[PDB]
Amino acid sequence: LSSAILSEKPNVKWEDVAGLEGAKEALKEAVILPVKFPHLFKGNRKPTSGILLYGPPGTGKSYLAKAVATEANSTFFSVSSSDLVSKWMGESEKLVKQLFAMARENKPSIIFIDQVDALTGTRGEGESEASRRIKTELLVQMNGVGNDSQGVLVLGATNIPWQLDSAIRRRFERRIYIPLPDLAARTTMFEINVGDTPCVLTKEDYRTLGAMTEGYSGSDIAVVVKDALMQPIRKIQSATHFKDVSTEDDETRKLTPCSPGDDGAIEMSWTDIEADELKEPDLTIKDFLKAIKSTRPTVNEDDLLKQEQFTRDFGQEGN
Amino acid sequence: LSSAILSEKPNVKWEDVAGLEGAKEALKEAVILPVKFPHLFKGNRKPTSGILLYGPPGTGKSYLAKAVATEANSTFFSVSSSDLVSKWMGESEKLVKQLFAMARENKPSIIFIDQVDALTGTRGEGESEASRRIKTELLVQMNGVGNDSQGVLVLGATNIPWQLDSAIRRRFERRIYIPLPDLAARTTMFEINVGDTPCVLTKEDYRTLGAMTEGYSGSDIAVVVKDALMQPIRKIQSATHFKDVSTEDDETRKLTPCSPGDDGAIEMSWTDIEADELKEPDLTIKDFLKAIKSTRPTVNEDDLLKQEQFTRDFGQEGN
Amino acid sequence: LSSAILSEKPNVKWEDVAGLEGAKEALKEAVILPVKFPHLFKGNRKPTSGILLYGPPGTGKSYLAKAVATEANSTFFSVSSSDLVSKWMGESEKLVKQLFAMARENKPSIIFIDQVDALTGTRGEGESEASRRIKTELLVQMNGVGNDSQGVLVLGATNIPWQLDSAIRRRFERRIYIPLPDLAARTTMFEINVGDTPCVLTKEDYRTLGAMTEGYSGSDIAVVVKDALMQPIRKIQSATHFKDVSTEDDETRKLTPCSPGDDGAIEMSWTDIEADELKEPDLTIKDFLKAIKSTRPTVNEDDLLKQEQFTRDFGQEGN
Amino acid sequence: LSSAILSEKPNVKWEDVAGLEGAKEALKEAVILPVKFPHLFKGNRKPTSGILLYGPPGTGKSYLAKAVATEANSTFFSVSSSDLVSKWMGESEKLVKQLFAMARENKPSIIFIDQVDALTGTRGEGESEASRRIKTELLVQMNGVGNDSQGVLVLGATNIPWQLDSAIRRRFERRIYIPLPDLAARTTMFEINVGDTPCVLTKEDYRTLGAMTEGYSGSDIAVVVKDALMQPIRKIQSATHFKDVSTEDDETRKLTPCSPGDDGAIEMSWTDIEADELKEPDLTIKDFLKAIKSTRPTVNEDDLLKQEQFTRDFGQEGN
Amino acid sequence: LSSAILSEKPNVKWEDVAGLEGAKEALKEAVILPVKFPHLFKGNRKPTSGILLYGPPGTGKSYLAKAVATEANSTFFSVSSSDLVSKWMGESEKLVKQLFAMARENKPSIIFIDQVDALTGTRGEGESEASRRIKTELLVQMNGVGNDSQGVLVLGATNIPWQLDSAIRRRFERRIYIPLPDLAARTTMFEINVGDTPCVLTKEDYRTLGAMTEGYSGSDIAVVVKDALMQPIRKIQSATHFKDVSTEDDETRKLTPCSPGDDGAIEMSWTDIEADELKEPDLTIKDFLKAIKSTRPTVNEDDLLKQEQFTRDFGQEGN
């Protein structure tokens, strides 16, 4: 009956996100201000009810959701459109009803629905079975507790706003475009993703990277980072020739991979090698270079045109 | 649901696996090096989640998975990807859901997904809806423990690696080719497959057997062995004439199958024969030779060349 | 607390089953050889037990079950999965355990389950919970049968192997395809069907009608045979003129129905003639020609395709 | 426990069924003749066990069943496929087994199952569990006693033969196709439906009608006959004016409705006239013409395509 | 067990139904004539057993039924598909059996099924589960008693004749198309609604209206009536100025709404005036004109093409 939804804390702060600080402000006003100063909502001043996040896949929509949850200071519900599709062919939406009941009983709460362009795909003919009933279930259940006493905020997520119907479109409120990161945002993400490795230095390299990598997502950036972090491990694996670097003041001679031609090149493998005596290769520009060679652009520009078209049409507001 | 997904703690060492040295080294550098130097994985440096075992069918990929499961020293969970349409579609996804949480509940552990290619291809329609949602679901489930929370290992198995989608391909790490067994491996299989039967002379005959088997799989070899074991039995059934051999010093005069022209060839049926008067044929080279002749080759060479084409394309890389 | 489930003495010999000598051999090795010489199954040659008969309907699978039951002289227990599903509202599975107990007490013993696919899957309305535990019970009994020393044999029968629960298949051992009879098997079956009936000229006819029936089952043959048998009876039913056959050396004058153009043609109704003094027309090829005419092609090829698929996918490997 | 089915029947004779004397022969030979002369079926010639009656609705399959039931004078049991299904979800088979027992009890019995396709096919829910198990039990029973020693005949009925489960198909004997009635049959039906009413001119009119009537069923024919038989009633109801028929031989006056200009046309209401003293108009051909005009062909051509497909594939078939 | 169907009736007479006197005749000849004069219907002449009413919705088929059972005044059953509902797998059919038993118990009995298509059709999916067996039960129950010995008439109502199961179609008797009303019928329907309101002038108005309202339904006509009825009430609602009509010969002074310029036009509200001492404006042509304007033709004419096609196949149909 219940179907358990996790409300635990994905500890991702505001500062861990880059860009669209204006949407961030809208969110601060939508949750934080209500939390902080509820008595400001007497008379005709009333909380925002629904926000859709729309844009290409891989743009930290989920990441944003995590940050929201961390920052909400209240009950947070998260669900994928995968969940609660069908059981018997007859019974689906009762679970939706019960979910909303649960949320209403926990004020303040926030519901996050991922991939709202699934359920509600939408395509005709085949909709008339259970799916139209679902579509209806959304529309009616958003009408229920909406007036007067609200402690629910609805966050949707979508890749394809243009296939989301008129009926949802001007009932469900506030829509915000989540673009791919620009040079600045990319650079900042690079700087965020470092770890303990001393790596290659300055901001010059970072800005070089964020410039050179363009049309890529946060996810893609993450991938590149992981790649580069593994590249020294890859060096360690493939070269069995190693060599001493550090002085004898340490525990012992500290060994790093080198070419077979190198002076001091001992060729035993990783297997014999003690924990202390380890010298990982530094993280160089070349790791990022090879990563870029391996990095292919994801999304066709037609999708950009459709997102841009929706934006020209509906944009930074619900409608 | 429940035993459709397996759980076990296998006890198969590296040395119990015929061959396979390059693959073994890959696994030791993919798992044991991490185990050797765990302090090297602070921050955004992470142990490998996904590895693919690829090659022709019948090569003990499952046995190999038991060996890595033993060496990594955790619980081995496993399922076949196509399983199961059975009656409901919906509850396959339910099984998919639970699985990841249940795996997280035993850190460390190993999930083995057999025939990963069965959920990805050029079919369309059914692939675009039902196997898409489970695919992207799998992708997201594997991603969720990505931030240094993981004790699970994902091992995949495929016969047709070249039908694997970019989406899986990129969200994933190491691929290892599992070739058909070579001389030494086949020979060792022949050594393992004996039992209490006295069998034939020395290791030289085993070497001969391993040599005469070309192109066969583990499975095929085992089948061949079973056939040769049954060959005396087959003789017992379809012989009419049995040769007398032993005198009254034994339980009684002992009869064994022989050709119609033989000295001491009495003609009655095996149904007339009891244990005292029985002489089962021994295991000769000829049993094994006719076993090998009556087992057809396994895999066409085009498939081998496509496996090797995949190797040339993707091989031992992250991608 | 007995509750007796069908046991009886069929009288079908090996020789009454025409063809499938390879399976027959396999079955003699599956049942009789184990019982005759158990000590032959020390080592890695193993007492195989769970055996599936699979293929199209009408091919004497049940007939074969009767034959081995006649021939093997081992206690043959024969049951539908439908039988003894429950009383309540509560308690099942006790009868299952009792059945397994009685079979263990009646070694050597054989359980024959027709239409094993009747137990399968993950549906609701009973199968999710109530028959799940029945299923489980089954699985645990058939697990324990392989444990320790076995005197029980499981024979499966199914027309729809692709609808057979996988978990069974994973637990289950040897699979044998029962094809439609080939030229020879059809021919022999004809000859079997004749028996005492006047046999007309030679084997040429039997081979011809053998060839001319393509793709038909045992059942399909049998109906045609019965039709032909009824043809002389039809010839008696339509009767005016009869004529004496037997000379004065015999016990009495013996009369058969004839055309009005016959010489010595006496006219009455078949009812007017006494039973002994009636001479039924012989069986001609035309009767069989008409029996063919009464049987239009009986083959749904999709089934054949599916059986081929299953045969290629499951049965080759042990599973 | 018993659930009472009645076997005492009305008097529908062979002669009330128009056409397919060959099917009649098959019925007589499968039922009456065996009972009459049991010694005919010693040795290898054995009575029919199964007959399927199929075709379009309205063709006296039920009528035929009543006719056989009249003529056979043995325990004739007849049942709907829906009848005796279950109560508490899974208690179904007891009544089935008991029924087959009951057939055994009173040999030679006849079982008629209407609309056998209602207990047939494959998909789920019922064909996963209940209708599955029930179908299975049916199958085991039907050939269970059928081959070897029998005293039951099973008659099936179906309008949709093409949906009949393959397995059931192969388990079942003798298909008889019921084609729509031809000129002769329709004529005979008209003659049957003459009643007491004076039959205007000869049988030539019925021949004409039989020719005129194309594609109609027994039911259709009966309805048109009824329609024509109401026409005199209708006429009576319409008239004011009636006239005396009664000649001097009759006891009292006898009045028939007539036109206003008639000799002795008195204009009171039909309600005022007593039943004996009223003379209904005789039936002329015009009433039957009207009847025909009113009732359009009942039969769509598109069913016959599938029926004809089945006919080409199986048809006048043994199986 | 027995459910609950109500039998008490309205007061709707034959004269309240404008249309199809021939259908009326069929009704009264198939119901009332049998009851009035049973001795007419001995031997081979038997009343109608099945009547289908088919056509567009809202044409007083149910209204017709009310008239029928008001007049005939015999045990009337009316039934919804909801009544006789399935939960425990086979309840419905049992309920059907019980129902027809009860019908037999209570002859003469009349059974009305609303929207018979609800319990109809042939394809699969949910048909194969409960609904096919339900249909089967229905059919067996109806035509087994229906032909020969009856005390029951089945009246069918459907908006979709074209999706009616062939088998049902043929086992059902007498079909009557219920068309949209023509001029005369429309006029009569207008005349039905007169009431205490002054009729205004002549029949010329009624026939004018009848002419002007081509393509309206019974329902539409009813609606337009209500509209025109409420028009003076609406006027009274917006009324300010009133004036006296009834002189001192009546019980009291009686005020009616008037224009502001009127002789003694006093301007208070309708609410101020007592119910008896109010005079209401009469019904003028304009009120009906506005009512017509307000209600557009409801039925698109290309929708009736399937009723007309069905009409071309079956029509004013005896079956």
Ligand SMILES: Nc1ncnc2c1ncn2[C@@H]1O[C@H](COP(=O)(O)OP(=O)(O)OP(=O)(O)O)[C@@H](O)[C@H]1O
């Ligand atoms: N500022 C940022 N902008 C975009 N992505 C980021 C940012 N910071 C972190 N990420 C990345 O976001 C990823 C989380 O998944 P993400 O939210 O990109 O999927 P998604 O946009 O919801 O796509 P889908 O809707 O298809 O699931 C993490 O891998 C993380 O590295």
Ligand SMILES: Nc1ncnc2c1ncn2[C@@H]1O[C@H](COP(=O)(O)OP(=O)(O)OP(=O)(O)O)[C@@H](O)[C@H]1O
């Ligand atoms: N030698 C034979 N081979 C095959 N069938 C035979 C033979 N002799 C007789 N038959 C016929 O086969 C039928 C016996 O049932 P059979 O074993 O064919 O069913 P089955 O193949 O088990 O089908 P299902 O699995 O659907 O029950 C009888 O109708 C019998 O007349």
Ligand SMILES: Nc1ncnc2c1ncn2[C@@H]1O[C@H](COP(=O)(O)OP(=O)(O)OP(=O)(O)O)[C@@H](O)[C@H]1O
């Ligand atoms: N001689 C006859 N031949 C065929 N039908 C007849 C004959 N006499 C009467 N009938 C009709 O047979 C009908 C009885 O149902 P019938 O047996 O035709 O259905 P069915 O053939 O079993 O097929 P279904 O049940 O699908 O309609 C009655 O309507 C009756 O008018």
Ligand SMILES: Nc1ncnc2c1ncn2[C@@H]1O[C@H](COP(=O)(O)OP(=O)(O)OP(=O)(O)O)[C@@H](O)[C@H]1O
């Ligand atoms: N003489 C008449 N002719 C047609 N309609 C009438 C007549 N008298 C009343 N009505 C109206 O017809 C309506 C009833 O419609 P109807 O009986 O066709 O519905 P139904 O038969 O129950 O359902 P459906 O028409 O969908 O099968 C009522 O609203 C009633 O006011």
